[PDB]
Amino acid sequence: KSQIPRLSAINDLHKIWPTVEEHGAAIIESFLSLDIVRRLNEEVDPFVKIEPIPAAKTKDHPNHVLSTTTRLVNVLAPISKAYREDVLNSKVLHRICSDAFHVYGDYWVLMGAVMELAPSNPAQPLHRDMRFSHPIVEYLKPDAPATSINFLVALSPFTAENGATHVILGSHKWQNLSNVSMDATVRALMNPGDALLITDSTIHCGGAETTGTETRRLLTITMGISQLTPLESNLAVPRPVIESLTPLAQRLLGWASQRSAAPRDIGLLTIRGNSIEKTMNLKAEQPL
Amino acid sequence: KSQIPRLSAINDLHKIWPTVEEHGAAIIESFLSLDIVRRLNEEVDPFVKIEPIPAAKTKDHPNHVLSTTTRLVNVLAPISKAYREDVLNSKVLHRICSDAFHVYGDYWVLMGAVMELAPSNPAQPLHRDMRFSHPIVEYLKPDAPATSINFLVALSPFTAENGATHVILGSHKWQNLSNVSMDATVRALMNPGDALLITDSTIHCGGAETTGTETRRLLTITMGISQLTPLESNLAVPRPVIESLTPLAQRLLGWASQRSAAPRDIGLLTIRGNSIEKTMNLKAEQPL
Ligand SMILES: O=C(O)CCC(=O)C(=O)O
Ligand SMILES: O=C(O)CCC(=O)C(=O)O
Ligand code: NI
Ligand code: NI
């Protein structure tokens, strides 16, 4: 069977979204440089270590879906300089997203999270994303353009043996889900910095960690239209941090009003005809 | 032709949503008491007077749709004690919304706005709401449960001559829109405090002000699922005001995390497994 299409972030930028639109998946080679992967890893390292189990009883909003061998940490902006500056302003990310979401309008981050899988982490069931947070998406028409996409960035090597992600190519167009089998999958073998890009309709799953020794880590960036509510909030991020960001990064984190693609768009998160950033005189690019 | 069903907020509460589900519209008599209408009016009065034209060039997010004879003021929580306390905690509103949105999960205010129409304000074109802000809704399946509803509360008398709202009964179920005519409409004749409730699929329009003397005013409350982004932001509302509200009112204004109806819901606007209100130790019901 055919493998996931591989593309250059450098030479094939315009080809990335068309490829996903057709096959439901693509691997973007060197989506993040090794320098950014390295800095990102240093910055999130301690936060993944302290993270309790997904359904820890201390939690207000426990995650009962992820395995006990999974650690997920989100709201990455206050944690990671590399995240807030390099990845939130990614030229490649923003081209793909504008290609993807132009029919709808503005987009933002629904969730940016580092996921680390412990040795012997079992495979996830084959699934589509967004079903534990946005029931609305199941009521969209089959042909509606994707309202969210997910960049699964490798922060350590993805191998067949250490649980590299599985995808079913073309599955984003499936309606009848009775050929859903692991038999129909191909793997996303990736070096750190490579990214598997999928849509919210692409059938996929994290793979089984078989070695009992390797730890797999990824940065999952779910980008979605500004008409959908993010899974995470940046409301509690200190203002000096927010004010250190670019206007674009501020918008991505819900610290700006948003716009739809309606010809006479009246806007989202406005305040009596004016933006959030104007009203609160939110500054931008003020270093710490 | 058949008139818009009229219901008591007191005796027919359980019948309100079933009625709208069937006919696409219903009039809730005495939705707000005259006391609340009176206080609401006193509190918003000066803010409607100072409001410029919808597309005023000073505005960051101008509204190019509404007439120049329309004044709309939103983000009502800091303006109106009656709004933030009485209407945001409305027993009748919350029963209807939970009846309406239980399939999806939590709901919140997409926009609470006072609209005042000047004498001789022309009729609006027949329309469905949400099309200038949420293109996503047009891509929902025809039978998807409504993801937003609109309470059109009279703050002054609605008469045939002063431009009472028109609705086409049953139009929320229409797909083919070629019988859209003013010939197919009925009026929402209302006393102050009565509310016309419609869905985001109900075909309707503000009526023509014919007297050249009367000013018509309304409180439009668009309640919608927490998975959809509000048209307005409460991000800039002073914290003593937010902390004066009930937990429920805080949620409605985006000052709390939200939950979907997914059996293993992972939540919306969360912060590493915990709520906004916990993280920011947001207090509640602290009077001013
Ligand atoms: O672990 C992976 O490679 C995929 C993770 C995933 O699909 C998810 O957690 O939703
Ligand atoms: O003025 C009215 O009665 C209806 C207003 C309306 O439908 C709107 O502004 O969307
Ligand atoms: Ni997934
Ligand atoms: Ni309308």
UniProtKB/Swiss-Prot annotation, chains A, B:
The gene is asqJ. It comes from the Eukaryota. The lineage of its organism: Eukaryota, Fungi, Dikarya, Ascomycota, Pezizomycotina. Homodimer. This is Iron/alpha-ketoglutarate-dependent dioxygenase asqJ. GO terms for biological process: biosynthetic process. Iron/alpha-ketoglutarate-dependent dioxygenase; part of the gene cluster that mediates the biosynthesis of the aspoquinolone mycotoxins. Within the pathway, the iron/alpha-ketoglutarate-dependent dioxygenase asqJ acts as a (-)-cyclopenine synthase that converts 4'-methoxycyclopeptin into 4'-methoxydehydrocyclopeptin through dehydrogenation to form a double bond between C-alpha and C-beta of the O-methyltyrosine side chain. Its EC number is 1.14.11.81. Fe cation binds at H127, D129, H204. It catalyses: (-)-4'-methoxycyclopeptine + 2-oxoglutarate + O2 = (Z)-4'-methoxydehydrocyclopeptine + succinate + CO2 + H2O; (Z)-4'-methoxydehydrocyclopeptine + 2-oxoglutarate + O2 = (-)-4'-methoxycyclopenine + succinate + CO2; (-)-cyclopeptine + 2-oxoglutarate + O2 = (Z)-dehydrocyclopeptine + succinate + CO2 + H2O; (Z)-dehydrocyclopeptine + 2-oxoglutarate + O2 = (-)-cyclopenine + succinate + CO2. Its cofactor is Fe cation. Keywords: Dioxygenase, Iron, Metal-binding, Oxidoreductase. Belongs to the PhyH family.
